[PDB]
Write a structure and sequence with these properties.
2 domains, monomer, Recoverin, domain 1, signaling protein, mainly alpha, calcium, 152 residues, binds calcium ion
Length: 152
């Protein structure tokens, strides 16, 4: 049921004093205390480490629902469509999106990124740490971000 999703995002925005869309250490601990859970800085942190998939440092609604109900955060597209888009991005078609390909693509997209913005897009979407982005990390990234724009 998506009404469950709705109530969860409402609780989120309530405990998100900053309304930036991401929960911090203090807000996560305060929510968990609101539900009557004594969180140790250790628990609070292990939790953050279990959810922060983009390594941002803050827990976003997608990460929250991913720690809680893994398959509730569901992809809005299909693997064939996302494969077409990943082909659009990986121009050399080697199966990996380099920072060069990502920058050239975002340039075609009129998004004049900076070295720091591209580093963040890689540091956020790259999981296996090779510096590029394969199709699995690509789908992870777009599904985590699409789910955020749907419920934020
Ligand atoms: Ca926050
Ligand atoms: Ca995060
Ligand atoms: Ca490439
Ligand atoms: Ca990678």
């Amino acid at each position: 049921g998506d009404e469950q999703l709705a109530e969860l995002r409402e609780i989120f925005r309530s405990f998100d004093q900053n309304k930036d869309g991401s929960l911090t250490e203090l807000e996560l601990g305060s929510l968990l205390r609101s539900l009557g859970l004594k969180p140790s800085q250790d628990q609070l942190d292990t939790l953050i480490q279990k959810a922060d998939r983009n390594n941002n440092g803050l827990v976003e609604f997608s990460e929250f629902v991913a720690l809680v109900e893994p398959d509730l955060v569901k992809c809005p597209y299909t693997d064939d469509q996302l494969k077409a888009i990943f082909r659009m991005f990986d121009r050399d078609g080697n199966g990996y999106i380099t920072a060069a390909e990502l920058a050239h693509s975002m340039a075609k997209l009129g998004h004049a990124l900076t070295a720091e913005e591209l580093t963040g897009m890689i540091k956020e979407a790259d999981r296996d740490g090779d510096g590029c982005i394969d199709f699995q990390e690509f789908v992870q990234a777009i599904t985590s971000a699409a789910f955020d724009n749907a419920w934020g």
